[PDB]
Swiss-Prot record, chain A:
Species in which this protein is naturally found: Severe acute respiratory syndrome coronavirus 2
Function in brief: Subunit of the fusion protein that is processed upon entry into the host cell. Mediates fusion of the virion and cellular membranes by functioning as a class I viral fusion protein. Contains a viral fusion peptide that is unmasked after S2 cleavage. This cleavage can occur at the cell membrane by host TMPRSS2 or during endocytosis by host CSTL. In either case, this triggers an extensive and irreversible conformational change that leads to fusion of the viral envelope with the cellular cytoplasmic membrane, releasing viral genomic RNA into the host cell cytoplasm.
Coiled coil regions in record: 7-49
Reported effect, residue 8 to N: In strain: Delta/B.1.617.2, Mu/B.1.621
Name of the protein: Spike protein S2'
Mutagenesis / variant outcome for changing residue 39 to F: In strain: Omicron/BA.1
């Protein structure tokens, strides 16, 4: 428990990288977050939007 | 560019479309700059039998 200043630097970087990867699962309002799924469901002009 | 098609296929004369006219007869590019003009011609292009 004395090393909390160094362990928190490891924790903040792991938490930031996991947050950056978890944001790949989000839709941001799109029909699906899976990029090949959009390209199966829709044709070129709709898939581009 | 000028030609005759049936009314239901007019939707295929647009950028990024698919179906037998877009695929096998007349394909527009996705970055098409232009106008598509169409009118029903059943009073000229059509015959009994």
């Amino acid at each position: 428990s004395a090393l909390g200043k160094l362990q928190d630097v490891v924790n903040q970087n792991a938490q930031a990288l996991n947050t950056l990867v978890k944001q790949l699962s989000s839709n941001f309002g799109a029909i699906s977050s899976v990029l090949n799924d959009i390209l199966s469901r829709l044709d070129k002009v709709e898939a581009e939007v | 560019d000028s030609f005759v098609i049936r009314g239901d296929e007019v939707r295929q004369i647009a950028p990024g479309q698919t179906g037998n006219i877009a695929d096998y007869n007349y394909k527009l590019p996705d970055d098409f700059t232009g106008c598509v003009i169409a009118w029903n011609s059943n009073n000229l292009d059509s015959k009994v039998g």
